[model samples]
Structures are given as C-alpha cells and as structure tokens.
Target: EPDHPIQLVWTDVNGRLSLDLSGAHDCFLNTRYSNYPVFILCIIGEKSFLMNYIMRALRSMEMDEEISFKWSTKGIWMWNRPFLLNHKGGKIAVFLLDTEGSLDIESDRETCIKLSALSLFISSHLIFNVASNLKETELDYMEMYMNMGEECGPKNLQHLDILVRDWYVARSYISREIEKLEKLNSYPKVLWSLKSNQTRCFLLPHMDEDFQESLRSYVSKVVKGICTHIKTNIDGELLTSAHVFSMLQEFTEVLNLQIYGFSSPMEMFYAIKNQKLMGEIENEFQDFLKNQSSLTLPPTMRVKVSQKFSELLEKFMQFVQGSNTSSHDAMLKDLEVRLLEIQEKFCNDFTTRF
Candidate 1:
C-alpha cells in the first residue's frame, strides 16, 4: 500500500534486511521467492509481546484507550479497533495494529527452509489478494492453518510453500469482492474509529532494474500531466476590467475542478485567494491590447462586444492600479454572487447573436 510491499528476510549473505521492493524486477528469485524468510521468522516470533509494546507506545502518544488484538485460526492477526494519537500542539496521528516477527538465524538449515515456506505462503496470499478475489477455498486454507501448532523446519517449510501456491490460485476466485473506497470519504471514519500504533510488517523479494524503470516512467507521466493541465488551462489567460469579475468566476470554477475536489471548499477558497494577486498584472496587458489598434483580438466577438471589451479593459486597469491591498477574498465573495448576474445577462442579450 505504501508504494511497495515491505520485505523482511534473512539470507546467508545479507543476514537480516528489509527489502523495499516497490520497484519492478524481472528475476524470479526477487518476485516469487522474496518474502519467504521474513514470514517464517514472524511465525516463530508470535504476537503477544509485540502487541503489548505497541499498546504502550500508543498510550504515551496520548491514546489511553484500551484495545485488543484478534488472531485468526489461519494465523493472520489484526486489532479489534483503530487508535488515534493526538500529539502536543494538536497534531493528529492515526494508527492501526498489524503483525510482524523476527528470526534466530543460527538454528539450522531447516529454519531457513521453513522461513522460506512461510514467505511463500504470505507472498502467495498477498499476490492473490492484489490480483484476484477471495474465495471459499482460500478461506478454507487459511482456516486450516489458523491454529497450526509448532510445525517447523524443512518439512513444514515445504508444506507452507505448497499451501501458499494453492492460496495464490484461490485468490483469483476471491478478488471480485475487493472494494475501491474514496480517501475523503474514508478519512473521517478511520480518524474517529480507533487508537493504536498503525504498524505494517511484511516481506518482499528483491527487485531488479527493469521493474524500477517501469514504475518510474508511470509515476513521471502522471505528475507531468497534472502540472501541464494547470499551467496551460489556468495561468495563461488575461482579463479585461468588465471581464475581470467573470475571469475570477471562471477561474474559481476551474480551481474547483482541479484542486477543490481534494479539500474543503473553504480551504480551496483561501488557497486561490492567496495566489490571486499574482495575476493582477494581466489586467494591464488587457488595457494595452485595447488602446493599441494594431493588436488583434480573438475572432469570437462582434463590433459592439469589442467596443465594450476595450472600455472594460481600461476600467479594469484603473481599478487594479488604484487598489492599495489585494482584496482577493472580498472579490471572490462578490464574484460568487455576481456570477449568476453575468450568466443571466449573457443569455438575455446574446440568445440569437452570431
């Protein structure tokens, strides 16, 4: 969820390393076999002590509410509720309780094998979750391992890998149930729901170069598109005096489309106001266009409209030059009501005009 799957693994070469393999990699070793050791260690470590430590940290962060950890019969563990941490100066942090573990590497080769098996199980399950729907078969397999007693070392590791692969297949059947929730809609519900240290732990395989490049390309395109749209559509326009109010109204509507949807309307209003003054110079350019007959206007207007536009440009420049401070908020509020008046006038006067 955090751009990449968190990978924890113990190898003879790396000892213990957390692999942040959000990047794309082509090697089967990195993809299919990555989180094996990490899962085995977690299973060996169990949940009781770790959960207590997490709870204490939440309390210190001023989340004194009581909570419980719930474990599934199939070995998956989660908390009964969410937690909220209100730090000093009213900074709010939300936390969720998830599971993790460590391993004693010196034990035996069987330990490595078993951890590898557990890794396979977790990897397959997660891959299945991401790719396909959850199904009864997958649920049943989870139920089978929910209370798996001390099955360890090589044999269990081999068994776990098989189970993991089976679950992977089952995942396809279950994926249809996955839901896409909106961030704005879910934030308030999650914020008010729980108190705990929101921790996530997992294992991922090492990623290779090709995968990384692919991911980078995807992200770059998304960011560039967003930036280009704002610059081209919003920042390039000059407004005349009479049309200054109309420009502000249109700009507000565009701002609402590009940025307001992500925030509160009041926040959006204030953000645009903060930057509105930077565009005031455009009104002077509008006047320059009106006074110089050599400059061409767009073909979308008639002679009467063009005359009114020139007068509006002069008045707009005078108004801007005379104003002492940028009254952006007052202008925005005025425009909000005046927008309807402009719409009404445009419709009444231009109903049949070319």
Candidate 2:
C-alpha cells in the first residue's frame, strides 16, 4: 500500500564544508534511483525549432492519440505526482529543458547527467543562441554526464548526435566537448568512466526541413544511428515516469539553488514543499493574473481565474451556480486546473520578471 515519496528539496552531501553543498559537489549523486528509459533533451538554444522537430519525429497527429497525456506538451505535470512516484519501471519519458540564457553550467551537469537521456543542441545553426565558450556553454556540463553514465546506468553507454547546421571548426565544439570528456572525468573520484564503446558521437549532414516537409526527418536520423546502442547498453532495465519526473524536479531545484545560493537546505526545502499549499498557490496565481502583460492565455484559463474576472463564460459560472449541493470534488478540480495553468505560466516566465 506504500509508494515512493519525495520532494525536490535541497540536500547537501559529501564533506560538509561549514555547509554541505558549497555548491561544490554535484547534487545528483544523492538523487539516484531511477526506474526506466528516461530521455531528457536539454536544449541550450532558442525555443524555435524544438516544438516542430519533435512533433514530426514522433508521427503523432496529436500528442496523446494513444500515448499518455503525462508525456503531452499541454499537461506538463502528471495527474497525481506523489502516486506516479511509485509506479513500475521500464517506461520512457522525454523532457525538454531550456538552459539557453541561464549561467548555471556546472549545476546543470551535476543534476542532469544522472538521468541519462540528454542532448546539448547548439540552437541556432550559425551562432549558438547563447555565448560564452566551450567551458561556459552547457556542453561542458553535458560532458560529465556521459562520464558518470559509465558508473550507474541501465544504459551505461552515451551518444552525441551533431546535426551540421552550418559547418565550422567551432561547430565542432560538440566534438571538442568529446575530446575533453575522453581524457578527463571531471568527477575524478568516481571510478565509473565511460566505456570504450560505451561512448559514441555522430557528425551528420544538416537536416533543415520545413514544417511542410516531415520536420524531424532532419533530426530523427541522427538518433536512429544510435538507437541500437541505447538498447544494447545496460546496467539493468529502463525505469518509469516516476524516475524521470523526480529527476527533472531535482534538476530544477539544484539549478535554482546554484543560481540563488541562498538559505539553508532545510529552510529552502520547507519553502518549496509548502509551495503547493492553497495559500501559496493563490498569492502566485493572483499576482500573475493582475500583472501579466500578454492577455493571451487559453480561454479556459481566463474563465478559471474569474469572470467575476471573465464572467460571461459558463466554465467560470460552475462555482457561480454553486449551491449547498455543490460537490467539493468539482470545486477543487476547477481550482486545480486554474492553479496548474497559472503555476505553469508563472514558472516559464519567472526568470524574465525576476
């Protein structure tokens, strides 16, 4: 009757330096325990081609024709997170993280590398969407991930598929990142280094197809070259959505911590844990509704918020016609949807406002 339980709270491990995480040791080491083939594509560029390319790659007319809505772009979080945490393993989950402009390169690698399925696409074909260097860019962070993959993985092997957008010596940064990872295990204390065949790289001709053409054909082939390798590699069986979702949240937590470098782990943990409370939800959602400039939410969102804020709508009127007989479940479900909508948009836009 019991299930896996966790909150993406801050935890400091290794030799405590007056503090545990001096922002020194990687946080992911503590967050292991995966259940399936969890594929997280961490894009370090523009948000442009991402949607189109993946939409084509998967051959779905719409996201969840048969697939789980948990994997849908529309519903970012699961129906019951605390419950899904305990589900069986061997399923697949793909997550898209945009670290284009943020500067937590080291933290990204530390948290993300553990989850396995990852990609560091240089967004623009010409010049990367963000600038810095081989070190400053997210690629350096990606290198350690594969290195660590050598140690603890159901899929111990790692692959890099570099689709040539416009050829250049620097575009070879993907390869350069490889050259660096080959000799160096940034986490030197860890005994698991990438296997000789365990590591792979791909330098393919560019695929710049339009939406009219099947888009992912451009990018999907690169992955095709490595699918067998992914299957052949091993530590055990692939884990489930539970593993990936937790890792994603863990990644987000560590990334935020590394940037803010504020408060103790427990204090921060408690704050995050309480964020789901109704009080916390109302403050964030209400502030966002009043302040957001773009009046472009789906009509459902506006109605959910208020007609009394958007009153003409029937959806908003459900609670309006609420009598003594109004089901508490119905009332909570409406607020839940509204909360999710605001929280999702608030997070996506948080850094901009901050």
Candidate 3:
C-alpha cells in the first residue's frame, strides 16, 4: 500500500488553474521508478465507488499486498505508489487514476469538459462506469467525446471498456446485448482498436447473489485485460512513467488556457515530437563535443584535424538519417553552425598554443 495519496487534478483550488502541474510532474518524473512503461487505468464515475473499485483491483495483484486507497474530497487522486505487472514476461508499471463524478446535467458543463478531457487523454484503459445501461444519451455523450477527440487530432487510447453496473441477464447473454449497440460501430473516429480484444464490455449484476465473488471476478478480468495495453502519449509514442508526468503537466496547461493555445491534440503531439527529436540531436552533439575535449594538435596536425572534423560530420549525418527532409534540413543547418564554431575554436587554440 502507498503511504499517501496525491492530488493530481483539481479545479477550484488556489485560484482555479485546474491542477498543480509542477507538483504532479515532479511527483512522477523525479521519482526513482520513473522509467518503466505505464499502463494507467482510470475510472470515471462516483468517486467513492470508483476509488473502491481501483483499490480492490490494485490489491488483487498481490504485489501491492499492503496497498491501501483512502477516500478524499480531492478532485482526482493518484497514489504515489506503482504496481508492476507482468506483461508478456516484461514489467509494465501501473497507476490508477480515481476521478470523481459523472457527466450529468447537475454538473457544471465547463468543469465536466475539463475533467473529461483530461481523463480521456491520459488514460490507456478507461473503465467508463454507467450505473445501469448504455442508453442513447450515454452513447451520445461518448459520440461528442469522440468528435472532440477527432477534431483535436492524434491517437492515444488503446482499449475501451464500457463497464456496466446493475446489468440484467446472464454472462452468456451479455455479449449479444452489448453487440446490439450498433451505433458504436459507426463512430467517425472510433477508439483506436486494431485488435478485437482492445474493446470490451464488462458487466456487473445489479446485485449479485455472490456479490464479493462477482466483484472479484470483474476485477480479475479487468486486470487480465490490462496486461494487453501499454499507455501511449498524444502522438502514440510509448510512454515511460516519467513521460506521463510531463504529459499531464502539458495537458493541464492546455486546459488552463481554456484561457488560450493549440486547438487540437495534433499540434501538442507534433510539438512534443519535434522538441524531443531536436533535444536528442542536441544531446548527441554535446556528447560528441565532450568526447573530443581531449583533442589536441598531433605531430601530424592536418591529418588529425581533418579526421576529427570528419568524425563530427559523420555522427551528425548518422543522427539525422531517419528524419524526413524538412526536419533533416533543420537539423543539418544547426549541425553546420555548430561545426563551424568547433572549427574556429580548434584553429584558435592550435594557433595560440603553437
């Protein structure tokens, strides 16, 4: 069990910025266990019920034997704890996001949009809890969600588990019933499901005869289903636990800007991608320069200088090899500018010493 729960999202706190972006970022990224791939399972519904459900599921894993989830009035809670699950013989870190409330009219529209938007973009496996049935209204809600997502652009979600509560009928008849929701098949930008297993219908009896056992079974199925998913970012980039922190922060910024900024998720995704690629090239350049720090005039100065400069040029070429022409040229331009700097430095140092 984790020592304490941390608030990851809140709307009315300390001036209504929606969330503490940096706190969440440092909480995840600065932690020692930040590099593993994360599989976030977020439940959106009544906080108490969703929190209970997540706690039970996390406990069922056994690895988190002592883990405990405490109820809170906080908007959205995430444990500082991480549970490592076996994924095809490799470990994938799991985090549970407990989101409170529903998208009903009683709720403020703006807050609903902010909460729903943040939850949808961050979660890999969303257990969308509906108390009784998948009514037309609920489907319409989802349709609007998909529309907003599609309008924004980009892919992240890998699985959709529309969990139904107080469901009527036997397990055998369950599949057929949900399959009747034909409209789900026709959504313009459906959740990215390339495999049949990626989308599922999880049903729980209105009141099970063996309630505890039924709940256990449901959690087991969810956990088993989870093994198949690994969280991806706005660009569908595989997310390390650390990366998720940065993403959460950036996502919060966009919502805060409900004040201002990118109209779609694509811009955010592309921007992050470009930033990462450029950063990678910059790091490589720094490494090259560091490695060459001991460089000095050899008795054969011309040969040594040419060889060193060629080494830098070769590394730059190799670094940008896979980039498309547009980015490729930008990278090449930066490399050329840096290369000249190095050339001038080497010449000055050699002249001054000799």
Candidate 4:
C-alpha cells in the first residue's frame, strides 16, 4: 500500500469532462461513444470526509481537514489483484490524467482549468490539438506546463505528455509550432521550455485503422513502435498517480486566485455568503434523498420528467453548490443517479429528457 500511489480516475463523459467535486478518481480514462462517460474507476472512497486536499482559497478549516495521509490506504491489482487488490470496482488506475480535454487563454481554457483540478493525478498523456499550421490558439494550448509560472500557469503539475494526432511527416509543419513555443522560454521566468513541458511527439505510424499484411507485421510496424515511444514520460517524476493529484491541486489554487474576478476564492465564499437559509436548503434536500421522494412524483411533476429533472437538478446543484463536504458529495451523486433513473424510465415517451 505504501509503495503505490492513489489514483483518481477522471472519466470523460460525452466530452463533458469535469472534476467530481465529490473529489473522486475518474470512472474511465477516455470518452468514447458520443461523449458518454465510460467509467472505469467505479467507486469513490467514502472516507476522509473530515480531511482532504484543502486548497488555501477555501475560507474555513473547521469544516475540512487539510492534511495528507489522513487517509486509508489500499492497493490495486494488475486490474484488481491488490483492494479486490483495491482496484476500484475491480480495475486498475495507471497514474494518468486522460484529460479528455478539448484549453485556452480564453474561456475555452477548459484543459488547464479542468485538468488542473486533478491535483493528485500522476503522469498525464494529453492531446495536443494540432491544427493545420502554427495557429495562435493551438500555440497557447501548447504554452502552459503542469507547473505554474510567473506568466500564468499551474505549479505542481510537473510532467505533461503531448500527443500529436494527425501528425504528418512534414518537418516544417512541426518546426513552425516549435518556433512559437520556443519564444515562451524567454518569459518572466521560463519554467517550461519545449523540452520541459515534454513537448516531444512520438512518431506513430499513423492511420490506426489500416489493414496489415500480417499480425506480426502489425505488431512490428505499429504495436512495437507504440511500446517504444509512449513508454517513458518527460519529467519521469510526474509519472506517478500522486504526482498528478498534487500538481493539479496546486493548479486549482492558482486558477481559483486568478480566474474568478470577484471573490478571489470564488467557489465557496460566494455560494455560502450569498445564499439565505442555506442550511435549511440542504436539510430539505437531505430529507428528500433519505425518503426517496422521486418515487411519488405528482401528476404535474411527472408529466414532463425532463422539466421535473431540471427543477430538481437545480435544487440538487444548489444543495451541493460549494465546499465539497463528504455528505454533500455523496448526496450530490445519489441525487444525480436518482434523476437519471427517472429520465431512463420515461425516456421512450420523453425522448428529449436525457
């Protein structure tokens, strides 16, 4: 247990990637089948409610414990050999951040903004969205490192692996992008060079769906190269699970400080400060959950389960809006599942509900 790092799998659901403020590992690594989240990491640990990775921005300590190793340790098997071998839902978490990303200096900065939340993830092999040329948006996308620099970035995320999809064999095409990235090196501090960010791209044979002459040929031409190229990471240090989580935590702190214009620590302070009778709101939601009230939706409420879901979803969100306390997170997920169940039951009639 002590030898292995804890993995929090971030599932890319329907390309709608998000941090489970419930503070979970992801359900699956990549999003497939039209952005639906194919969850691999099954269950989130129900422990350490009293303690967690406390970002400095959150105001109170009494509600949450800010300490590492204030946790329960378990091991994952090759898949589950180790917690069933600790493999959550009986699967492995290979210390990785499969961003399922899609980032930017603008609000489209979702990659850094979201992936940075995974402070505890280890090595992340991310997608470097390569456009036709050395475009502006793509360059900025290639700009930030896992670590934050004086020029706007994430600090703890040490290693980042970039995947050059649709990578052709043209030398100058890549040269152009590198030239732009090289300029970032002479910045206020130059924390990440093209080399530092592990900006190197592996030469995959391309056209994955190609028909091979022989199985051995395929392995020799494709599989073997795949093995050789992706085997090691840039800052080998960032190749572990805990490394990802730690770095992402640092990144989240950085974003919370800068991104949110008004509050500085925009998440919790504003939500709790602005709401009236917030405790009462939580209590009612909790009551609704404990009693399983969705079973008895009135005629009007059930008419369009979609509308009902929307209304209750708003309330559920309000209930778990800020400060990811354990119970709140548990209920947040619980209520979400309940809503989905409602959607599925009448999905045939209300095809739009989903």
By TM-score, the best candidate is 3
Please provide, for model 2 over 12-84, each residue's C-alpha lDDT reduced to its tens digit, 9 standing for 90 to 100: 3521111122221222222342334434433333234534354344333123232111222110111111111
Candidate 1, 48-150: lDDT as tens digits:
3333444444444434453223232211232322223333333222122232322223343332323323333322112111112223333322222321211
Backbone clash total, candidate 4? 36
Q: On a 0 to 1 TM-score scale, where does candidate 3 land against the true structure? A: 0.59
Model 4, poorest ten-residue lDDT window? 76-85
- List the candidate 4 regions with Cα displacement exceeding 4 Å: 1-93, 101-125, 146-162, 166-170, 180-197, 202-254, 257-354
Candidate-wise lDDT, in order: 0.29, 0.34, 0.58, 0.33
Collision pairs in model 3: 1-66, 1-67, 166-206, 257-260
Q: Higher-lDDT candidate among 1 and 2?
A: 2
Top model number, lDDT: 3
Q: How much is 250 displaced in model 1, in angstroms?
A: 36
Ranking by TM-score: 3, 2, 4, 1
Q: Rank by lDDT, descending?
A: 3, 2, 4, 1
Q: What TM-score fits each model?
A: 0.16, 0.35, 0.59, 0.33
Q: Where in model 3 is the C-alpha error above 4 Å?
A: 13-17, 46-74, 87-90, 144-157, 168-197, 207-209, 234-237, 259-354
Backbone steric clashes in candidate 1, count: 22
Q: What is the lDDT, from 0 to 100, of the residue 28 in candidate 4?
A: 25
Candidate 2 residue 230 C-alpha distance from true site, Å? 6.3
lDDT of candidate 4 vs native?
0.33
